[PDB]
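Bug report (template v2)

What were you trying to do?
Predict the complex of my protein with adenosine-5'-diphosphate.

What happened?
Run completed; filing so the output is reviewed.

Input:
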Amino acid sequence: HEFEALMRMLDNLGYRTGYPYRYPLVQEKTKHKSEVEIPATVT
Amino acid sequence: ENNPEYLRERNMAPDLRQDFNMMEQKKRVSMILQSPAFCEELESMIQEQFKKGK
Amino acid sequence: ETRAEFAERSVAKLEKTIDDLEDKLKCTKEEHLCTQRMLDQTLLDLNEM
Amino acid sequence: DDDIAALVVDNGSGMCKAGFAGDDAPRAVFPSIVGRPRHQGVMVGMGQKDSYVGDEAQSKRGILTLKYPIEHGIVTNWDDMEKIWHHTFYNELRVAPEEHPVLLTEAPLNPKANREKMTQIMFETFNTPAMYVAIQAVLSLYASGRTTGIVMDSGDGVTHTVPIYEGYALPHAILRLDLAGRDLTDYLMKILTERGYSFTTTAEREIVRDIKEKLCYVALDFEQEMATAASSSSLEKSYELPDGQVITIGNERFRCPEALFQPSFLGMESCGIHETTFNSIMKCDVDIRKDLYANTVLSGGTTMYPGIADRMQKEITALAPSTMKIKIIAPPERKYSVWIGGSILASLSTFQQMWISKQEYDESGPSIVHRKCF
Amino acid sequence: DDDIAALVVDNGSGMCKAGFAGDDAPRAVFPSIVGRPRHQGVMVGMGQKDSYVGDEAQSKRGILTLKYPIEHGIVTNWDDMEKIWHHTFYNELRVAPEEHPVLLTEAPLNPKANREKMTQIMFETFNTPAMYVAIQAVLSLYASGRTTGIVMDSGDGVTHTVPIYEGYALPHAILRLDLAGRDLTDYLMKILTERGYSFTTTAEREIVRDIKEKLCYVALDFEQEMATAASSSSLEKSYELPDGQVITIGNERFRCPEALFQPSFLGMESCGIHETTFNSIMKCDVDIRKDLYANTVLSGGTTMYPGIADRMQKEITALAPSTMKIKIIAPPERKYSVWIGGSILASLSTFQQMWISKQEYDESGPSIVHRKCF
Ligand SMILES: Nc1ncnc2c1ncn2[C@@H]1O[C@H](COP(=O)(O)OP(=O)(O)O)[C@@H](O)[C@H]1O
Ligand SMILES: Nc1ncnc2c1ncn2[C@@H]1O[C@H](COP(=O)(O)OP(=O)(O)O)[C@@H](O)[C@H]1O
């Protein structure tokens, strides 16, 4: 439990910690979408 | 064949002409204005940004 | 010029379909991740049940 | 509004674009150069002006000393800008400036006196009814259909990256970097002198710029590509000069744009563009990081090199945290997008409160633009 | 003599100099010219040859077409180059090249393949054990006694200014200008036509070069000196031709070298040498400019005009900021200084590690010189 919090905090600072998190942090409520978007990504 | 509409066309560089053709086909400005939700959303953005200004 | 026009329309449609398929891939990875972590948690628990 | 459309004039450092608001295409795009004759004219009756502006100047490259009024995004010759604006209003569009509003674009970080001088010039001489100043990088996101994302812009003047968060430009996280197309052209000369081809005058700089535009690409892996170019001659291509000579560019095609990613080639001690974008996102708060990695828009003239998109995606993936949503959104018309965003912004009905009246300027001097336009 | 001593060969466009390692003075200095007869020869049984090389070519100027093998610092006829090198090794020095190593000097910015050619015809034909190639202007700084400073070298073929910091040169700040003494000789021949005297063949160009070497100087102020020549006739000198005629050049004494500072006389776009070295300094970092102003060293044959140092110092002080101090360094033997630097470089014990071995060349082909020589 503790080690994930430490890895998450180092990720927030910016160290590229490769430790895989067992559960997601934030819910990430769906943002506000427009149809006239160019479709993303470079494929 | 003496009007200036002919004149600029042969004074166009070719790539600028072709970019005009492509973005003519593409019609970005018309789509942004025709979409209701994003249009009134950006209206709200600029309106209350102005309201925050003065 | 006409050939370029076909190719442009085909590009647009196909790249939108690429985005849809990639979103499906993302959903499938998170299904793996949930099942794999909970299987590993079951192994760690070592419960007869 | 209905009777008169606002003039959308984009003043790029290399090119100048102009058109009417609410229209899809700009009416006139021309180079922002001014040339003066360098040789004595002996033909009495053929007619020689004191100076040539725009496309007329670029037609007669051989007898002129081309000068750029905008240098590194900073105006260094204001009466020269008066000439380029006079040429834009009267010759290219054939419309009077006193009967229509005008829209001006600007770099995200410019001196206050520059804005004051633009406002004073636009009101005092041209006597325009209404004007407005917009940030160049903001309008690209409006043309993108977005209100939240990071905008990378690269023109002939300077390359800067900004974050935009529901139409708000964060002033602290805007980052600047002096890797423009002109420096790439100069490095193209510096690497072309190896093969044996020498270009030294300002006339040949346009030839070198055309070579850069037509025959360049970005390597996905530099180390593998140098070995590939050394092994075989399949990468070599030939270009045909205006005097009829034929040159073989060969190895240098993926060496010209590589100065963008590694600025140590040009002698600059700064970091690459990928590190600049990464640090720009790093300076913002945690909450908006997810929608900045998941939303990146490329814009500017320099960003149309083939293969820049995949290389940019890989280099920003290498610096991002693990299992991070990374995507690059590059429109095909990415270096006409600022004019498109300007016309879009001028098209709205709630935008008409942004206009600065002539009475307001006459009351409050040239310093009213900063209070009216934040 | 007991041990094999290296040969230091300085090879520019104008003259070739050759000497032994560690010596104070070069043994041979002679013009780099290859002449061929043009007139019909009817005198059977006496001395005729199909080609004349070296000082013998300039002795019999009246029956030859003089032809310089090196043009603008670039070798354009390799057979004449081999003939020059053969005459250097055997006629003048009279030592076989297979016993001793050789050291060559070359221009900073140049076509790549030239170095390869300088490799291939030196190991294959002359069978040297080892060689090395060094930049010409670094040796001037080594001979002056300084490890840090900016050096201008303006020979007969090309002008170049390089800044060197801590004895270790900066490639990005190297500036090269194609304006040298031969163009000054051509300009002097063109402006001597206006007085009535005409010079058209190759021997006349040699005579005009002698006139330039005898009677030229650089004015401290161009306008004041021109008005002074407009006032009186004290600025007139008489030169006696090999025919026996006497010419009075007068006003043209300070107009020929003035093309160095104002290249608009020749129609070239590039500006003078002083702002060239000013831009070379400005391309470097801010911290090192203080040492660069105080350590400016002049070198090359063209920099032996009287009054060049004062005019150069005045112009570069006008360009420099007022708080900075300017020091010009003009050695009295600057014309040979590069060769002197070579004699320093062939005497160092660490330099024994620098030599390109014959076995290494046989292993790696002619491309060994890029990786071995810096
Ligand atoms: N089709 C193209 N291919 C490659 N490079 C291009 C192309 N079009 C423009 N460029 C580069 O973009 C630069 C022009 O940038 P521009 O968009 O005018 O800058 P600004 O944003 O200041 O208007 C030119 O120097 C040119 O090198
Ligand atoms: N004393 C002098 N006064 C004026 N000009 C000179 C003098 N000596 C040499 N020059 C010019 O410099 C040229 C020789 O330059 P030099 O340094 O020998 O070239 P390099 O050594 O690079 O071959 C000559 O052609 C001549 O025009």
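What did the reviewer find?
The pocket of adenosine-5'-diphosphate (ligand 2) is lined by residues E 12-15, 155-156, 181, 209, 212-213, 300-302, 304-305, 335 (CB under 6 Å). Chain B touches chain A through six residues (CB under 8 Å).
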